[PDB]
Amino acid sequence: TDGNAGLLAEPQIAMFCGRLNMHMNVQNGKWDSDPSGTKTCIDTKEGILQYCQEVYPELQITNVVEANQPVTIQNWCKRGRKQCKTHPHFVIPYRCLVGEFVSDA
């Protein structure tokens, strides 16, 4: 039965102003557009953390950081996940960092 956790992609978000935010589909490794069909680029770190939590509600995301590598992404969409174009844009995505909760006195 021996495992391969690496078959799951890392949770991350990517932004390009003028288009809906993208995020990594953990299960299939593809970049998908915004689940609500409405969210566009975010200009605060706190907003990006909130967005990670919205897209990955069960992952215990507690922090975010820019990824090491720039990434090319196709299929950016407008509101409603409409007028999706194959035109590529490269951006630096943000990794959604899973937190390990511990107890305090």
CATH, residue 38: 3.90.570.10
Domain, as residue range, for 16: 1-105
Quoted resolution (Å): 1.3
- 62 known member of a binding site: no
- 39 known member of a binding site: no
How far apart, in whole angstroms, are the C-alpha atoms of residue 36 and residue 79?
Answer: 9
Phi (first) and psi of residue 5, to 5 degrees: -65, -25
In our burial notation (b when 16+ CB lie closer than 10 A, e otherwise), range 7-37 reads: eeeebbbbbeeebbbbbbeeeeeebbbbeee
- 88 known member of a binding site: yes
**Domains in the chain, number:** 1
Rg (CA), the chain: 15
Encoded tokens for 32? 């998908």
- 89 known member of a binding site: yes
Residue 32 to residues 14, 26, 74: CA-CA distances in angstroms? 10, 10, 10
- 82 known member of a binding site: yes
Phi (first) and psi of residue 47, to 5 degrees: -65, -35
Non-local CB neighbours of 45 within 8 Å, separated by 6+ positions = 64
